[PDB]
RNA sequence: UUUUUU
């Protein structure tokens, strides 16, 4: 139940807009 | 006083003069002037040529302290490195009484960090930390990072390739304003980690050493010894009796081998200390200071001291156990010969991968790591 | 294994 390398790119994409 | 040409605060320039600095290194000349403007920085420079002073002096110049408000955050990979970086902030903020700094890492009660964060005498404007504890401060809202203007990641290649540190750093990075300056530093920024870095920068100034043949310090003599595991103890004891070193760092691949090797060194009239995980942080720091303040000339440690640690008396680094990949080797040997001074590195090759990893180091950096001559080496060639 | 909150 911990984040994949997948999702960490997706969180930072969402962070910048 | 070459730093005065950067047109820095009089309190900064005065503290820089008390630190013996008089000529900026090439990385500081290429990074500081344009970092002062808030431009994002992705910086690569060889080991020990002064990347800390880049983001330390830069953030201190842009900083205008607002009481109780964290403006600058610096992330590293090791606890003692964070302690070292915070001590550099203390020495350059010597004549800035308004500035307050704090460092946070594991091994200490988090409730005390919470109290230190609320106190009006200790509420920091600049926070240095390891990713684990700083995330545990953001998520329990002991710290407020809604006002960060400068975000620094030191040893960024290690911080972002280890994925537990990347999650924490990205959780911390999402509690900060998006319109902040972000700076990243490392002696090793391979082609595979730079795209991952760029997802935190916005039109950054990028300083690289792409011809990685001068990521090797010319003043660092590198040798290897091909031996068997049962011969390491007697060969190391002989090396420490014959070679003429000021202080030596000995890198081991595990904590059990660190404590057992250090115990045998102290038994054989080789006074040594050891620093690694699995140890109370009260004890890790106590020995760090004992070795840093020259009470013992020998330190055995894991990769906890592989990166960032700066002790000027280290002119001998011994890879008792070799690393798995070349990048960690370059940081390891970088602990010796700080700021382009003379140094000597010797690695033990006791198995098959020591030979392929030693094989893969030489193409990456152009260095011929010669086999240690059986007749020994001249003291002048590394003094 | 080594580094990183408990
Ligand atoms: N311009 C300078 N003049 C003199 N000494 C310096 C200068 N810049 C850095 N140093 C010293 O060199 C040592 C290594 O610096 P550091 O920032 O740790 O290198 P890096 O971060 O590139 O590994 C530090 O102890 C620092 O005091
Ligand atoms: F490049 Be230094 F050793 F952090
Ligand atoms: Mg450094």
Domains, chain B, ordered by start: 1-215 (3.40.50.300), 216-383 (3.40.50.300)
Q: Which helix (H) or strand (E) holds B314?
A: strand B314-319
Annotated binding-site positions of B for ATP: 45-52
Helical axes B131-138 vs B163-173, angle rounded to 10°? 40
d(CA B44, CA B209): 6
Three-class secondary structure of residue B138 per DSSP: helix
Contacts of B174 in chain A (CB under 8 A): 11, 15
- CB of B338 nearer than 7 A to strand C: no
B128: left (phi over 0), alpha (psi -120 to 50) or beta: beta
Residue with tokens 């994409």: A13
- CB of B110 nearer than 7 A to strand C: yes
Contacts of A13 in chain B (CB under 8 A): 199
Q: Which helix (H) or strand (E) holds B142?
A: none
Annotated binding-site positions of B: 45-52
d(CA B362, CA B196): 26
How many angstroms separate the Cα of A2 from the Cα of each of B23, B164, B316? Answer: 48, 9, 41
Please, are residues B27 and B50 in contact by the beta-carbon 8 Å criterion?
Answer: yes
Cα B251 to chain centroid, rounded: 15
- CB of B143 nearer than 7 A to strand C: no
Task: Name the residue among B133, B199, B185, B190 with its Cα closest to residue B155.
Answer: B185
> Determination method here?
X-ray
B50: left (phi over 0), alpha (psi -120 to 50) or beta: left
Task: Name the residue among B65, B64, B108, B62 with its Cα closest to residue B83.
Answer: B108
Non-local CB neighbours of B257 within 8 Å, separated by 6+ positions: B320, B321
- State if residue B308 touches ligand 2 by the CB under 6 angstroms criterion: yes
Please, are residues B285 and B83 in contact by the beta-carbon 8 Å criterion?
Answer: yes
> B28 C-alpha to center of ligand 1: Å?
10
B positions 137-196 inside 8 Å of A (CB): 163, 166-167, 170, 173-174, 178
């Amino acid at each position: 139940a911990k984040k994949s390398l997948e999702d960490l790119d997706k969180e930072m994409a969402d962070y910048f807009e | 006083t070459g730093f005065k040409d950067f047109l820095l605060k009089p309190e900064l320039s005065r503290a820089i003069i008390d630190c013996g600095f008089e000529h900026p290194s090439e990385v500081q000349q290429h990074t500081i002037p344009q970092s002062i403007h808030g431009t994002d920085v992705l910086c690569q420079a060889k080991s020990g040529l002064g990347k800390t002073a880049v983001f330390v002096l830069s953030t201190l110049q842009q900083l205008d302290p607002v009481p109780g408000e964290v403006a600058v955050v610096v992330i590293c990979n090791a606890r003692e490195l964070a302690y070292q970086i915070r001590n550099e902030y203390l020495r350059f903020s010597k004549y800035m009484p308004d500035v307050k700094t704090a460092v946070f890492y594991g091994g200490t009660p988090i409730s005390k960090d919470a109290e230190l964060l609320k106190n009006k005498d200790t509420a920091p404007h600049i926070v240095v930390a390891t990713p684990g504890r700083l995330k545990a401060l953001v998520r329990e809202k002991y710290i407020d990072l809604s006002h960060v203007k400068n975000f620094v990641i030191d040893e960024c290649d290690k911080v972002l390739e280890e994925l537990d540190m990347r999650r924490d750093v990205q959780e911390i990075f999402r509690a900060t304003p998006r319109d902040k300056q972000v700076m990243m530093f490392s002696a090793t920024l391979s082609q595979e980690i730079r795209p991952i870095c760029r997802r935190f920068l916005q039109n950054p100034l990028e300083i690289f050493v792409d011809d990685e043949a001068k990521l090797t310090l010319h003043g660092l003599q590198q040798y290897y010894i091909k031996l068997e595991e049962r011969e390491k103890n007697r060969k190391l004891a002989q090396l420490l009796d014959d070679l003429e070193f000021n202080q030596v760092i000995i890198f081991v691949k595990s904590t059990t081998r660190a404590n057992e090797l250090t115990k045998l060194l102290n038994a054989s009239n080789f006074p040594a200390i050891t620093v690694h995980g699995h140890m109370k942080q009260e004890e890790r720091i106590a020995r760090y200071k004992a070795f840093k303040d020259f009470e013992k000339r020998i330190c055995v440690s894991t990769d906890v001291f592989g990166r960032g640690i700066d002790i000027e008396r280290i002119n001998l680094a011994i890879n008792y156990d070799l690393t798995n990949e070349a990048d960690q080797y370059l940081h390891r040997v970088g602990r010796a010969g700080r700021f382009g001074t003379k140094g000597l590195a010797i690695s033990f090759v006791s198995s098959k991968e020591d030979e392929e990893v030693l094989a893969k180091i030489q193409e990456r950096f152009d260095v011929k790591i010669a086999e240690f001559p059986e007749e020994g080496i001249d003291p002048s060639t590394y003094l």
